[PDB]
Amino acid sequence: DSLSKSPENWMSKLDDGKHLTEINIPGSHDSGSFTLKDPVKSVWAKTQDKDYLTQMKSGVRFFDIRGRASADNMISVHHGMVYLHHELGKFLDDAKYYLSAYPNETIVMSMKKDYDSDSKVTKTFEEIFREYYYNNPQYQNLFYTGSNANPTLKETKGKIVLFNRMGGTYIKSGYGADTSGIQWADNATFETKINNGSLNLKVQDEYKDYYDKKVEAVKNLLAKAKTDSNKDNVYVNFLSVASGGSAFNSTYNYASHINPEIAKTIKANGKARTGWLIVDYAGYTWPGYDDIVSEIIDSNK
Numbered sequence: 001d002s003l004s005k006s007p008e009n010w011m012s013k014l015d016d017g018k019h020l021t022e023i024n025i026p027g028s029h030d031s032g033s034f035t036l037k038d039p040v041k042s043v044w045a046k047t048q049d050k051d052y053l054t055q056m057k058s059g060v061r062f063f064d065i066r067g068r069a070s071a072d073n074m075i076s077v078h079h080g081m082v083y084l085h086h087e088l089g090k091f092l093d094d095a096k097y098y099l100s101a102y103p104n105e106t107i108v109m110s111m112k113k114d115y116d117s118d119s120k121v122t123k124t125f126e127e128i129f130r131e132y133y134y135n136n137p138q139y140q141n142l143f144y145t146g147s148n149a150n151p152t153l154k155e156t157k158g159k160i161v162l163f164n165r166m167g168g169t170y171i172k173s174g175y176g177a178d179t180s181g182i183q184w185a186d187n188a189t190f191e192t193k194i195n196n197g198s199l200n201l202k203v204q205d206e207y208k209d210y211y212d213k214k215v216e217a218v219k220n221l222l223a224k225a226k227t228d229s230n231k232d233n234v235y236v237n238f239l240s241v242a243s244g245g246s247a248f249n250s251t252y253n254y255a256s257h258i259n260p261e262i263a264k265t266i267k268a269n270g271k272a273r274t275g276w277l278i279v280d281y282a283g284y285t286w287p288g289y290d291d292i293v294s295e296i297i298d299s300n301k
């Protein structure tokens with residue numbers, strides 16, 4: 001019986017000793033944009049329709065969280081200048097609940113500054129996150145705090161793994177958790193060594209692409225992962241694409257076709273390594289076409 005049919009805890013069904021790197025993970029791009037209702041804002045700033053807990057119930061384990069310091073102790077979730085109507089607390093509290101109810105899953109959480117801090121803010125984004133969230137008492141036991149750069153599933157069971165997109169940081173656990181952070185190339189397919197050289201991150205993040213290009217970039221990186229047995233390589237590619245104006249053109253209209261297209265490829269490829277794939281409108285189904293989150297889930301042994 002395929003893993004898809006039980007996406008509330010497919011990771012529990014996996015060999016503990018695999019590095020998260022090795023596991024093919026479903027991710028949601030701009031994970032918290034589900035709260036947006038505005039029809040015009042939604043064509044470009046909205047990337048999901050399911051809330052956090054539902055995303056998790058549907059099997060997504062990589063959450064792309066973008067934030068803005070609103071106060072010296074609070075980080076607002078954002079798609080750029082657009083406030084997505086909740087603080088980071090909403091996500092972490094949602095992660096805590098789920099992780100207890102399904103103690104054999106792990107969540108990787110990407111953290112990024114997406115917009116400038118309020119005028120009344122004293123501290124840096126990194127300081128506010130590190131000191132009021134990463135090691136806030138209320139979430140002790142929640143984050144990974146080990147010292148392994150390439151954590152095993154067993155090591156992270158029941159925890160959030162920091163994926164550090166904040167620049168340099170004093171947090172000492174997670175991917176890119178050092179004073180260098182991650183070297184992110186704008187609108188590109190790139191490689192960069194992270195965690196002191198102990199990991200080679202590989203990203204397809206060509207978000208300005210048009211349809212043909214995007215699908216090609218997704219599939220090019222996808223094919224490289226198919227071959228790569230290396231536990232020290234990380235693969236993250238976003239199927240997601242920046243919309244246009246108009247709505248036509250909208251984020252959903254892209255995801256509505258990119259997701260199924262990449263979904264058919266993956267299933268055809270049998271069980272094989274895919275890397276971490278980050279999608280818009282995860283959990284969104286269109287009858288007749290394959291589900292990208294399901295085929296990602298099903299490609300793990």
Ligand SMILES: O[C@H]1[C@@H](O)[C@@H](O)[C@@H](O)[C@@H](O)[C@@H]1O
Pocket residue numbers: 029205207238240241242
């Ligand atoms: O442009 C932004 C940002 O620069 C991210 O790195 C990219 O991955 C997103 O997809 C988004 O649209």
